[PDB]
Design a protein around this ligand. Structure first.
Ligand SMILES: N[C@@H](CCC(=O)N[C@@H](CS)C(=O)NCC(=O)O)C(=O)O
Length: 189
């Protein structure tokens, strides 16, 4: 965590470009006196989002064979626009904070587990991430009464069924196909 890491990410240009916005350069450094080109936004439903590797705050070092470590903002946009259909990026990032994985046992109340979900493949809740997220916890519901499950939590598994890269519909189906006592694997940020 916090340690610098490097990654090769190749993207195929969609109808709406590569699906990310950038800032920085020697023109207007984004962090102090650091002239690096930074990802500021991952566009929902775009190429970078579907590929799920690129992250906000990644520094682009190379675009194909073009060195963008110390260039202007304009020279960066040009390099990306001119890179063709298949774009080879070499990036650097500080490793993100690790998440707490936790198994939670819930007994249904009169109205179920007491929480709602969003996310899924082709229905991303955060751009670049196919995970199933908790979006609402119902007042006085089972989850609320437990006190562990929170907004923004990830559901990784329902009993023995994993929810890694599944459709939203499949996540709802897994939660429905349960008995009264449900075991959930959850990730907390
Ligand atoms: N491990 C290889 C590949 C790592 C890599 O992707 N290198 C960067 C710069 S050190 C690069 O120029 N990649 C884009 C390219 O394929 O030319 C190397 O030593 O160059």
């Amino acid at each position: 965590e916090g340690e610098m890491e490097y990654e090769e990410i190749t993207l195929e240009r969609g109808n709406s470009g590569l699906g990310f916005s950038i800032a920085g350069g020697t023109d207007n450094p984004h962090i102090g006196d650091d002239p690096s080109i930074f990802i500021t936004k991952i566009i929902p439903g775009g190429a970078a989002a579907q590929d799920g590797r690129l992250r906000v705050n990644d520094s682009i070092l190379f675009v194909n064979e073009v060195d963008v470590r110390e260039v202007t903002h304009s020279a960066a946009v040009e390099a990306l626009k001119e890179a063709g259909s298949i774009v080879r990026l070499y990036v650097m990032r500080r490793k993100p904070p690790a998440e707490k994985v936790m198994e939670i046992k819930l007994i249904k109340g009169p109205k179920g587990l007491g929480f709602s979900i969003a996310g899924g493949v082709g229905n991303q809740h955060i751009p670049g991430d196919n995970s199933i997220y908790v979006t609402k916890i119902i007042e006085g519901g089972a989850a609320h009464k437990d006190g562990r499950l929170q907004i923004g939590d990830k559901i990784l598994a329902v009993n023995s069924v994993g929810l890694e890269d599944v459709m939203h519909e499949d996540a709802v189906a897994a939660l429905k196909n349960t008995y009264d006592v449900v075991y959930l694997k959850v990730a907390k940020p």
